[PDB]
Design a protein around this ligand. Structure first.
Ligand SMILES: *[C@@H]1O[C@H](CO)[C@@H](O[C@@H]2O[C@H](CO)[C@@H](O)[C@H](O)[C@H]2NC(C)=O)[C@H](O)[C@H]1NC(C)=O
Ligand SMILES: *[C@@H]1O[C@H](CO)[C@@H](O[C@@H]2O[C@H](CO)[C@@H](O)[C@H](O)[C@H]2NC(C)=O)[C@H](O)[C@H]1NC(C)=O
Ligand SMILES: *[C@@H]1O[C@H](CO)[C@@H](O[C@@H]2O[C@H](CO)[C@@H](O)[C@H](O)[C@H]2NC(C)=O)[C@H](O)[C@H]1NC(C)=O
Ligand SMILES: *[C@@H]1O[C@H](CO)[C@@H](O[C@@H]2O[C@H](CO)[C@@H](O)[C@H](O)[C@H]2NC(C)=O)[C@H](O)[C@H]1NC(C)=O
Ligand SMILES: *[C@@H]1O[C@H](CO)[C@@H](O)[C@H](O)[C@H]1NC(C)=O
Ligand SMILES: *[C@@H]1O[C@H](CO)[C@@H](O)[C@H](O)[C@H]1NC(C)=O
Ligand SMILES: *[C@H]1O[C@H](CO)[C@@H](O)[C@H](O)[C@H]1NC(C)=O
Ligand SMILES: *[C@H]1O[C@H](CO)[C@@H](O)[C@H](O)[C@H]1NC(C)=O
Ligand SMILES: [Ca+2]
Ligand SMILES: [Ca+2]
Ligand SMILES: [Ca+2]
Ligand SMILES: [Ca+2]
Lengths: 390, 390, 390, 390
């Protein structure tokens, strides 16, 4: 007491449903009296007792006078913040963890590990925090743009596993994994296989033995690089997802990429972080994923699922499981996370819904949550409700 | 450590008194600096250590720019929120539990169960949350409009009981009860008797054996359907309240519905959720109710009591027990709840006091609280103090 | 664990010093973004682990549109609120305990007892709350204006003692004391002696055997009625303070009231709640008191002290101990309270500094605190810093 | 349960890195809805479970109407406030500890000791608070201007050590040390050596036996007086730092003060509080310092380190260890502090970054934090991001 946490069997269920919308800019009107933080790249991570809603803030509020620059990704002001999930992340509700323009976090059963990358592009620095204490750092190994998941890391028996990558956004970016224990990096993991470009991995436990991630290739393909990480041997291998249902944005028509599973295909350049989460059952594994409704634009978000098989080798289309966000609403980064029920884990997907009015106004996001619950089919979609002119 | 909660004997007392007003829009002036949430359908539920003040928000604040739509009931933005009772439910104080346009919640002695219905009208979805975890769902069975109590559910020995209903607002709505244990629906209960139309049940423990509810018939009668639910056999029966003191709004004159207790009578169309709470004594049960002072309008709120007898068979008027809200002030939904003292339970009735300026402006509500305390007669009424023009 | 608290010997020291200013209207400008609550009658009460700053709010903020009425004492909106001492009592920081236009509170070692009087003037009602639960009430016994201390009640071995009074503001008001245990009134105490008019008692422990109070006579004298309450026999006696240093406002010149100690003297009509607190030493008792610098107006506040003797019988002038508030700053109600150090009690006096611009604007107060600390003499005075035009 | 705290070996690491910015005035726009407090002289102190971010407020917010006076140092409104480190210090987040225009604070492993000086210049008063209780005071001994550290005090085994000083800002200010146990001054320590002028000491543990301080001489020299305080014998000695790298501002060129280590040299008038913190290793001690990048202005802040030797006798330059704040940004007071990891201590330096637009506008500050973490070289600087016109 407290004990290390481990992945458990998932809670019973067979469909996702609309759970919760965090839409702080519903309160950002000039007529209003609130101060929602301007953010992007939200994610959620849960421990034994609570869930935290994290994001990267531009250290500015709406309404405010610092909108200029909020459409960019990196600067000296960007910070990793969080609130307890369900609270509106305002100036006062939020806590500022560390300076960061790329982030992650995960609870190991005893304490929170927070991860923030900042610094100049060519020599950025990953900083590790354990509770209140800054405990370790890790250096840029390709001197291009060291960065991390923008979603939860994953802990088992006190060992927290984290994806990082470094390299050109439009070229080679070979990722690695760090094994972090009580805030200190105790092992590096160098993946083999199809390693050309892997970033913004969304990772979870397929079992006590294996972590899988669905990631983004920003240069070469609209198929998602798919990591299989063995946590017993601390080794990782990556291959493209073979599914005809290409999960990236942009992407070509489903199934249109000819040749073997590793064929890159058309419209590979560009990308989006994608949602992915495991439903671990006694004798099968459900893999849930999300992608935009639009093939080319960050609009809408659909849910998909496949049980079992080998994602590296199966071209089978994923089963379309419902519209979480209609194509009329923005659908940007998405991520997986799991909530800890008393005796089982509940898989969820979160969706960043960015308010984009161009660089001439503020630029921020709402966060929508869908979770496995009950049976049947997914019933309702999510709108942000935000009018950017107000 | 902790243990399951059970209803106890009520604390001594023989009259209700004005306890507390939560009037958030006292701070919603355009000249002000506050952000009260636009809400309706408030209710309260307490556990061993705290009381939570719940409501359904339209995800908008006053002052703000999203007033349009706030007089409606169902949309994709409504959420179940809560604060600790005594705190002003603002943007920042509140926590958002889940997407919902109909709600309930209750503590079982160990944890909170949160209940929220959303989805499309003809295929709505009840969602169950236990602590942070989404644990179960229940589907529309009439495919008309699945909905729930808008007040506390009732747990005993870990089993929480909840009214749901489904059907046309102007036709048949046959309710059901769900037995829910640690977030999971473990039994469905199909009531017998007068089941024609039952919705918005206000329920509480008459004893360790019986839950009773005072509900709303929105189409056929101004008498309230009265549920008796046997918690040992998990069976329920419903009959109209026979009291001449009809508790719904609108309603005809007291005693004017002639014939046997089950006669429906006139002005049965329409209705209102009604307050109801038990005073449990050693060999005597007090039943306390509230109804608007106006027969046709949602204005005022009066308190009533009757001891013992059979509400199904007794035509005698309930005893008038004080003006909680004068006819000059709004009196909308009302509900019962119990606060846990060290060794006994304190029964209370809460009153939604809606600020209604029609659809061209904001639409929200204050909450007044009356509790059993001391002896004598109820001494003072409650006003919201809100000028909607400000 | 936890244990009942008892008064202990005071911490070492021989002078008071400026400790803390709570001045919420420093943040109430129309140019600002805060919401301090409009309040009056502040007081402080401490338990084993924290101090709470209480006050009676008009349920309105500055800036705001409900200034009209905030110069009055009683209405249906007035509420007892509190924050942890050191926090600014704004809309969001404060917690609303109960409806009340007269108040008190005290911790008994295990739990908080909150006291609120509301209702119509001729039949007001004292309500008792223990933790979150409403537990008891007490009725108007003179049907004129039931009211209470506007400062902390006093608990010993679980027994909490409270002054109340009832009667005309300009006539007879015979006070009583209630003995309250775990939120329920278990004994009434009817004082003997000079009982004509006693209100707004400021009470504390002279020892484990005796509570003393310095109170206000609003009709007959500028001497303060002085209560001696024996907590072992639950009996109380009241006599006027004999000191030439008349502690009320208005008052005549010091020492100018001729005749025996009970002589009423000139300028008896009108009054002000006064500060009073005990310094309990091994073999002597220090009584600390406060009164306005002005003889006739609520301006300034000076500190006074006398060790030992019989306040009923000693005409000796109190030793003037320093200016806490200069005569250029407002000085309204004042009160005593004690902070619990690890092994000893620290005596303090708090001062209500009202911002009074007349009934045509807002009307509220800052709170200044002085405490026994170290030796020597009192060094610095307190200003509110507030410009009422902003 | 809990036990007294002691300094431990420092966590491993060999460079500082940018950790966290607290820039409250990023939200202080007139177009905004926030209320950052106007503050100066921030510092940080951590205990076993949390770090507190302290400052001295002028009891005014931005935006607000009390800017006039905020560029001054001493008045009757200044207060020591704090938030949990990571929270934005606003009107509502902050807590007000006591009236003070000079401050300090530290945790002893069981409880917080708060230190605040106020009163008139020629008769100021140091006040000690332990938890909620005011426990002790210490009087002006030179009757010129009693003042204290503006940074954390240092506790070991329950004994907390604190620098105080008193004297003319432009003449002799002979400091003293107070030994404080559970809020009470149990010993005075009179330093020997070069005691001419010592103020604003930044102190920390070199070991279980020795506290060291880097201080400010405001009249005679740009070398920092360096205190060595033996905590076992309770004796202290002071000598100028001999390093060519003069740490004060203003200062002449490095190494340009000729003669023996004790030579005062030129441009000694004026000064600035300087950062200083220990890296304790098994057989090696790291001393980390900060000084402005400008020789004459409060602009920029650079980090420096030197291992071992005797700071009193060593003229060798400290090693430059990175630009924490470039010369383009304000660099005012700086201070050291330590965060408690599970088993080791993390040394940090904080930097006050003042927003100075002169006396015709508001005057306040951000706080930048750098901590020991990882290896390599310090990688990124800090900006406030504040446009004072907004
Ligand atoms: C992963 O391993 C953990 C630890 O072995 C498994 O958790 C245990 O499950 C058993 C049976 O359910 C319990 O009796 C233990 O108390 C659990 N250990 C704990 C809580 O620390 C977990 O089930 C495994 N995950 C799987 C099999 O998916
Ligand atoms: C309902 O049943 C519960 C459980 O049997 C009763 O609670 C017990 O009350 C007795 C004293 O009356 C206590 O000594 C027990 O410790 C209680 N048990 C629990 C589990 O709380 C409860 O009193 C019953 N309620 C009514 C109204 O009779
Ligand atoms: C009032 O009575 C209480 C209870 O008898 C006294 O508190 C005790 O003091 C002794 C000696 O200081 C301790 O050993 C006990 O533990 C205390 N009892 C507690 C803490 O419950 C208290 O000193 C008395 N007040 C006086 C004498 O002024
Ligand atoms: C200063 O002294 C304390 C107390 O002796 C040291 O703390 C102990 O450290 C050992 C291991 O190094 C632990 O096993 C003990 O439990 C610790 N005791 C306490 C009371 O904390 C501390 O290490 C010393 N600091 C330095 C820098 O040597
Ligand atoms: C508010 O929204 C509704 C959509 O149902 C629309 O019909 C109505 O015109 C809107 N009101 C205004 C003022 O635009
Ligand atoms: C601010 O206050 C000072 C008092 O020291 C006064 O001299 C000055 O004129 C004031 N400024 C304004 C703009 O009134
Ligand atoms: C910010 O926007 C302004 C307005 O066009 C532009 O002039 C300026 O160059 C921009 N600066 C940055 C850093 O984006
Ligand atoms: C409030 O003030 C207005 C303005 O003079 C006055 O007309 C009205 O009678 C007042 N009402 C109350 C209740 O004080
Ligand atoms: Ca791509
Ligand atoms: Ca009806
Ligand atoms: Ca008088
Ligand atoms: Ca100098």
């Amino acid at each position: 007491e407290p004990e290390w946490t481990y992945p458990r069997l998932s809670c019973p269920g067979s469909t996702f449903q609309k759970a919760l919308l965090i839409s702080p800019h519903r309160f950002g009107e000039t007529k209003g009296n609130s101060a929602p933080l301007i953010i992007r790249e939200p994610f959620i991570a849960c421990g034994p007792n609570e869930c935290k809603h994290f994001a990267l803030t531009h250290y500015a509020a709406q309404p405010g006078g610092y909108y200029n620059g909020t459409r960019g990704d990196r600067n000296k002001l960007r910070h990793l913040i969080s609130v307890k999930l369900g609270k509106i992340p305002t100036v006062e509700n939020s806590i500022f963890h560390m300076a960061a323009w790329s982030g992650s976090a995960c609870h190991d059963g005893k304490e929170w590990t927070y991860i923030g990358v900042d610094g100049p592009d060519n020599d950025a620095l990953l900083k590790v925090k354990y509770g209140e204490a800054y405990t370790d750092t890790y250096h840029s190994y390709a001197n291009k743009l060291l960065r991390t998941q923008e979603s939860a890391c994953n802990c088992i028996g006190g060992n927290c596993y984290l994806m990082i990558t470094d390299g050109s956004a439009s070229g080679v970016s070979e990722c690695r994994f760090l094994k972090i224990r009580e805030g200190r990096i105790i092992k590096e993991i160098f993946p083999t296989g199809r390693v050309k470009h892997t970033e913004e991995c969304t990772c979870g436990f397929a079992s006590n033995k294996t972590i899988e991630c669905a990631c983004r290739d920003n240069s070469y393909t609209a198929k998602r690089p798919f990591v299989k990480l063995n946590v017993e041997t601390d080794t990782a291998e990556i291959r493209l997802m073979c599914t005809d249902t290409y999960l990236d944005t942009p992407r070509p028509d489903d199934g249109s990429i000819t040749g073997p599973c590793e064929s890159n295909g058309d419209k590979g350049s560009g990308g989006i972080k994608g949602g992915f989460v495991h439903q671990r059952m006694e004798s099968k594994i459900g893999r849930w994923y999300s992608r935009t409704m639009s093939k080319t634009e960050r609009m809408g978000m659909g849910l998909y699922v496949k049980y079992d098989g080998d994602p590296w080798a199966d071209s089978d289309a994923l089963a379309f499981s419902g519209v979480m966000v209609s194509m009329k609403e923005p659908g940007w980064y998405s991520f997986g996370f799991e909530i800890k029920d008393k005796e089982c884990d509940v898989p969820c997907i979160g969706i960043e819904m960015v308010h984009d009015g161009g660089k001439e106004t503020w630029h921020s996001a709402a966060t929508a949550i869908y979770c496995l619950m009950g049976s049947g089919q997914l019933l309702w979609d999510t709108v942000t409700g935000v009018d950017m002119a107000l």
